[PDB]
Amino acid sequence: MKIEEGKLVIWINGDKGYNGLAEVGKKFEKDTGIKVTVEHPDKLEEKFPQVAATGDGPDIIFWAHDRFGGYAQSGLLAEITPAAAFQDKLYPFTWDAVRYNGKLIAYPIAVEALSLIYNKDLLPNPPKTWEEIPALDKELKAKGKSALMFNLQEPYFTWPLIAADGGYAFKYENGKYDIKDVGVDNAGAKAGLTFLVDLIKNKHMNADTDYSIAEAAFNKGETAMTINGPWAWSNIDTSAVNYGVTVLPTFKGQPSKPFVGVLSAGINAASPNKELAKEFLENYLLTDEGLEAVNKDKPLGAVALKSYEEELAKDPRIAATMENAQKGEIMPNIPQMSAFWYAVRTAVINAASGRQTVDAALAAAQTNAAAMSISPSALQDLLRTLKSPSSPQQQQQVLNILKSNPQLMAAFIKQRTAKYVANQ
Amino acid sequence: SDERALLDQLHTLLSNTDATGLEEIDRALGIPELVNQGQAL
Ligand SMILES: OC[C@H]1O[C@H](O[C@H]2[C@H](O)[C@@H](O)[C@@H](O)O[C@@H]2CO)[C@H](O)[C@@H](O)[C@@H]1O
Ligand SMILES: [Zn+2]
Ligand SMILES: [Zn+2]
């Protein structure tokens, strides 16, 4: 039903250090008397557009910026209007990642890029290229260990190899991402996914290795390398593995190009606490103290706040993160990114498991890179707009909805005319 | 079948709420005018 008025519900992904974020919520609570609740649901990036479509869910949603355009296209986020004095606190390229159709739709938090993590004790010199990993594995498998384990179930982790020699999502032409030009099944992406599949066929990796298996194997010293982001550093720190964070290996002499994500905090368009959330994000979280509380839980990476990024400039692991980010590409925020990730996830899974050939999986993924009817129905927008704070712009949304849907216009007339005779 | 479950929620939303936002929508739709036609003929 109604989002609670007078408090803040926050949704953030389970690997992002929600406990540190909750600590800044408790400081917000002691300073204001407003309770802040941080939750971490499973399949968060899918649950939010489903519940917010009817005007439900959290006041603040945390995720990488690539999902937010589809959220904004479906009318699920409120426009972000920060002062010029606050826009100058964050780097402009972080603001660009959350700008959609000209309007800011989220607050940037931190910049995330995948890096090569390696055990310095097992591998004093990590490989510079993807090509030398098979020989490194047969050398390490002779002593029971293994070379590299990373999550193969999410295409986010295998995308750097796919894009390294020519793979891309949508081409950028004149400030507009070309929905028509998709580079999912070109020769560069074909050779990248083939190298990953070949290393499974040669038993250098298992097709079913996921996030938990890969992370535990590295933290237990079972594999010499892994591929992950900054949020994984603190779990490695408590494992006492002498690790290093360095540039990702090259493929065909080309640097692997990870998809750069900017962690961002959106505001629900149906939330009655839009002013409280702006106060929370600008004056409490986007501070040196606020980011330090989150970063100490799970590291953020290259934060958007200039002041704390200066304090965090001297980290070699953050320098390696920016290097891989500079070699990678910023993620598009267009609504079609939802269908892009779905298509590539199916191809990587159907090519790694042995189910389809690399060319058949990518060709099918090239076709499916288009969003299909994941837009709210005419019955949900009304419920969402009616469950949203009242304004002349919200009331006009209700009218244009009814004027285009007769049987909803009919239901509204019959239910309100009966109400109008209750008070005569 | 969730469309009916939302039609159940839209129904109970309109019958219990009486906020002035919906009042503006009632008047903009001419609902008070259509009811005043019923109370004569
Ligand atoms: O794999 C598809 C997935 O990639 C990205 O998700 C990342 C996220 O950005 C990171 O912060 C971290 O949580 O790892 C995730 C992958 O498991 C995109 O952000 C997401 O939209 C996309 O579905
Ligand atoms: Zn609801
Ligand atoms: Zn959880």
From Swiss-Prot, chain A:
Keywords: Periplasm, Signal, Sugar transport, Transport
Similarity annotation: Belongs to the bacterial solute-binding protein 1 family.
Pfam family, one: SBP_bac_1
Gene Ontology cellular-component annotations: ATP-binding cassette (ABC) transporter complex; ATP-binding cassette (ABC) transporter complex, substrate-binding subunit-containing; maltose transport complex; membrane; outer membrane-bounded periplasmic space; periplasmic space
Assembly mode: The complex is composed of two ATP-binding proteins (MalK), two transmembrane proteins (MalG and MalF) and a solute-binding protein (MalE).
GO BP terms, alphabetized: carbohydrate transport; cell chemotaxis; detection of maltose stimulus; DNA damage response; maltodextrin transmembrane transport; maltose transport
Any GO MF annotation of the entry: maltose binding
Protein induction: Induced by maltose and the transcriptional regulator MalT. Permanently repressed by cold shock in a PNPase-dependent fashion.
UniProt cross-references to PANTHER family, sorted A to Z: MALTOSE-BINDING PERIPLASMIC PROTEIN (PTHR30061), MALTOSE_MALTODEXTRIN-BINDING PERIPLASMIC PROTEIN (PTHR30061:SF50)
Subcellular location(s) per record: Periplasm
Source species: Escherichia coli (strain K12)
NCBIfam families noted in UniProt: PRK09474.1 (NF007011)
Chief location category: periplasm
Protein's job: Part of the ABC transporter complex MalEFGK involved in maltose/maltodextrin import. Binds maltose and higher maltodextrins such as maltotriose.
Protein name: Maltose/maltodextrin-binding periplasmic protein
From Swiss-Prot, chain B:
Tissues expressing the protein: Widely expressed. High expression in heart, skeletal muscle, pancreas and placenta. Low expression in brain, and very low in lung, liver and kidney.
Motif (LXXLL motif 3): 10-14
Compartments, as annotated in UniProt: Cytoplasm; Nucleus
Record's comment on post-translational modification: Acetylated by CREBBP. Acetylation occurs in the RID domain, and disrupts the interaction with nuclear receptors and regulates its function. Methylated by CARM1.
Family: Belongs to the SRC/p160 nuclear receptor coactivator family.
Domain remark in the UniProt entry: Contains three Leu-Xaa-Xaa-Leu-Leu (LXXLL) motifs. Motifs 1 and 2 are essential for the association with nuclear receptors, and constitute the RID domain (Receptor-interacting domain).
General function of this protein: Nuclear receptor coactivator that directly binds nuclear receptors and stimulates the transcriptional activities in a hormone-dependent fashion. Plays a central role in creating a multisubunit coactivator complex, which probably acts via remodeling of chromatin. Involved in the coactivation of different nuclear receptors, such as for steroids (GR and ER), retinoids (RARs and RXRs), thyroid hormone (TRs), vitamin D3 (VDR) and prostanoids (PPARs). Displays histone acetyltransferase activity. Also involved in the coactivation of the NF-kappa-B pathway via its interaction with the NFKB1 subunit.
Note from the entry: NCOA3 is frequently amplified or overexpressed in breast and ovarian cancers.
Assembly information from the UniProt record: Present in a complex containing NCOA2, IKKA, IKKB, IKBKG and the histone acetyltransferase protein CREBBP. Found in a complex containing NCOA3, AR and MAK. Interacts with ATAD2; the interaction is enhanced by estradiol. Interacts with CARM1. Interacts with CASP8AP2. Interacts with CSNK1D. Interacts with DDX5. Interacts with ESR. Interacts with ESRRB; mediates the interaction between ESRRB and RNA polymerase II complexes and allows NCOA3 corecruitment to ESRRB, KLF4, NANOG, and SOX2 enhancer regions to trigger ESRRB-dependent gene activation involved in self-renewal and pluripotency.
Name of protein: Nuclear receptor coactivator 3
Originating species: Homo sapiens (Human)
Record lineage: Eukaryota, Metazoa, Chordata, Craniata, Vertebrata
